[PDB]
Design a protein around this ligand. Sequence first.
Ligand SMILES: [Mg+2]
Lengths: 99, 398, 485
Amino acid sequence: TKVTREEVEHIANLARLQISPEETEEMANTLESILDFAKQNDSADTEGVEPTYHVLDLQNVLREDKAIKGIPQELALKNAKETEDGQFKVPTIMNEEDA
Amino acid sequence: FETVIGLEVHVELKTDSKMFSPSPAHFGAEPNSNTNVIDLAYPGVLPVVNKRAVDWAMRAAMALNMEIATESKFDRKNYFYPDNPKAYQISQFDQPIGENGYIDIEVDGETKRIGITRLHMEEDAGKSTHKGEYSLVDLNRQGTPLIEIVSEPDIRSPKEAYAYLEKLRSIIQYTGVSDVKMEEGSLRCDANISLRPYGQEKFGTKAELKNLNSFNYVRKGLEYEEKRQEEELLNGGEIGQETRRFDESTGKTILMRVKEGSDDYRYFPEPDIVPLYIDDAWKERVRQTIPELPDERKAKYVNELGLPAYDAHVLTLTKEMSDFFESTIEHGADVKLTSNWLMGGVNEYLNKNQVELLDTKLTPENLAGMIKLIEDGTMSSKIAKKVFPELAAKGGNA
Amino acid sequence: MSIRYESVENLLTLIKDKKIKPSDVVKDIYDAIEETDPTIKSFLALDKENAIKKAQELDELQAKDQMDGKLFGIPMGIKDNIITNGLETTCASKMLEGFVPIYESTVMEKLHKENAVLIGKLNMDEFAMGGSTETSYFKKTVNPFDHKAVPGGSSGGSAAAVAAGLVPLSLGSDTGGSIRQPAAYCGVVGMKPTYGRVSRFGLVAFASSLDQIGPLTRNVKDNAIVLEAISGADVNDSTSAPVDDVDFTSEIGKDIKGLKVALPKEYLGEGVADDVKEAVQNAVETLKSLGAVVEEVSLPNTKFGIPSYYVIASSEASSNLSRFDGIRYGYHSKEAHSLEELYKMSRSEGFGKEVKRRIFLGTFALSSGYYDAYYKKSQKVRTLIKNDFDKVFENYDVVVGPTAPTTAFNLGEEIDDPLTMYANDLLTTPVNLAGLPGISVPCGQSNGRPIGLQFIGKPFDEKTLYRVAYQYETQYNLHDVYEKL
Ligand SMILES: [Mg+2]
């Protein structure tokens, strides 16, 4: 109930997912149904219950500060589709139309 | 009409390896040669917490008079950007390793205790070189352990801001966890400023100042911004939330964007890193691993070895300088003599020769002599003119 | 394709007694594949050449009488969301088609160390989101017991390749049931060890706090063996548990008289079909005929498992899947001229419908104004779900009930109905939420389609799970049926 075009496009943006106003409507409803589905948790009594962030009760797992040489540039770029001069190449025209 | 401003400062910890990856923290000039699957954010990689980075983060927070957390976990700060591959920076939101501390500063007038609200651990982002209509991306620096220090919004003028950066830099420098040099990026700073006319609680426009690269430079933007929204408040002004870039050449701040609200980073606990439980023993080890900081080191130069005001501040500006001074002192250099010799003479020699490595050149063993040869041995000063330089960039005694 | 139906154990000994050459064992595997997968469609990338080579190396070692490794010369299929150095790993997504890992996951490391033989990668739902493997960008795996049915999700290829006699063992990943549900649908043995029992280094992340790798086999024993080869702490995974006792076969073959077994009433609730329910109750009786003591108990917060699981899983996914921008690897949109387009176009074109649904939900559940009411709430609910188990475990050794509410459903039956698809996780999600170990073994068949019996254990008590599972298996199993399909 009440999930507007606007929120749908604000989320798409927070997620960097391209969507068409021919997908937005469809997504507004989907989310809505999913949320209604999600709303089921509200019937659960959590007053005073601490959130579970970790299921395993470990503690202080740290790594000694000893460097390990990195892989070759060649290995690091091997899977990237666009590269130039040993780096990753990407568009950067900052115009509030594109961005 | 207080101009309220706070400072967001990041410091680069100088560890061997990165914060959540074994890759070295120091890299060569070859791009993307200082990485691994972790720094490259490959699918299925995990973060592994650098132990020393924690010890140093909580060493610098104590030196900052902060309450050290007992429970401290990491969180993800989610955002998409070429130099941040995972699309989330592992940081801390609640439970920052250090909270509510302060530092004392002297600004025109007297002493003002400025609060520091928090100190948390983060990882640095990679660098994005803007070439042509494209962008080049080097992940060599990605993952470098940083710590974020946010002042309480207590500082009250572009000058108090400078004094703040100086003392802070000074204190962090003494803990030996960072060279904290802004020309080297091991110390960065962003400022937030807003004006609220007296008698009322409402503020005018609020701005985040970006691209402030030097202590001297933050002041410029700070005091320019101050005047900029000073007009806005009076003339007509349209209240708003904004981010502004400081133009080094023109000295003005340029509006680079107007916030539509509060940047949503979807902060949430990092499940891949088990929580940290910092006990007393642990806190002790690092407690004791702290020298005498500048303030109490300076208060030591006041009544004991009763030196001046100016003197105390500049001799405690760096640990090395202050160590040099005290090593040279017992050696046989009259208190004042060396003070005046370091204050100016050596300080001016360093700046004029950029010989900032006060350690691999002239030594307290060597310098100690010169001051005696002047003290009484041979007679007085002018000879000191060139004996000093040579003795500084060359040999060992007169 | 002659030993293609032999168990890991027997195949193991058949190789140690030099009654068979590793190179021929593999020849049989690929023969099986070539003949059967065209119909089953459970395999994605095949690693035949490398496999061939490794076996040739194993023949020498055989001859020299130096056969080391718990899984020497044993064939293995690996879910395609588990990284394999040099082998195309796709997570069954367009986003990663053609992706060749430049590092080795920890379980594969461990598996090579034991001299297993990588036969290939298995099909699955895209990025482990789905309950039928139908979302794969590549193909739809089918249930060996019924070709009109789904194999389950997300590890359908792992459950199908084993049930179809293509490999004696396979790995899967379970986030909310992705190992146990496919196993239940394909009538095989699948286990999701305790959270922390198996390194996640090299597991393409779905939900970091819920994810976990585990094995799938044709019998309880082969399964325990495989778990011993992948369990253990790892300096590459901070959440990996420092528990040395990685022996799971020691108590197998031992009786279960006196074993205190809890049968949650909620596990036989309204969402459970009539046939699944009848089979599990006959299973309860079987356990009684074996001495175990079975009594009803309640896990009241069960009903909240699916929703709290989707909110948590989706949320984490909305963060673990963000690295996919087609910059350093993966799908890279060609029609992008701006940086915003590059992220938005690559991601929208590279991800399938279901994956984008989760991300949408997850991103929304974590956003400003909703965080406390959705994500935080779910995490609190997560606490409730675990407390339920903590309580039951105060008086019971294990917990039993059905793995899935129904038999496997039809291909295309719920592919366009995500909500009903989700309902299939009713009985599996509480386990990951509590971080417990849970195992599924067959316990029946309704119209030919297998039904699953699940045993949930205390943390790191997989051995007790294998003990009771083995006992039950001596009374019922489908050991002789696979051979006939
Ligand atoms: Mg920061």
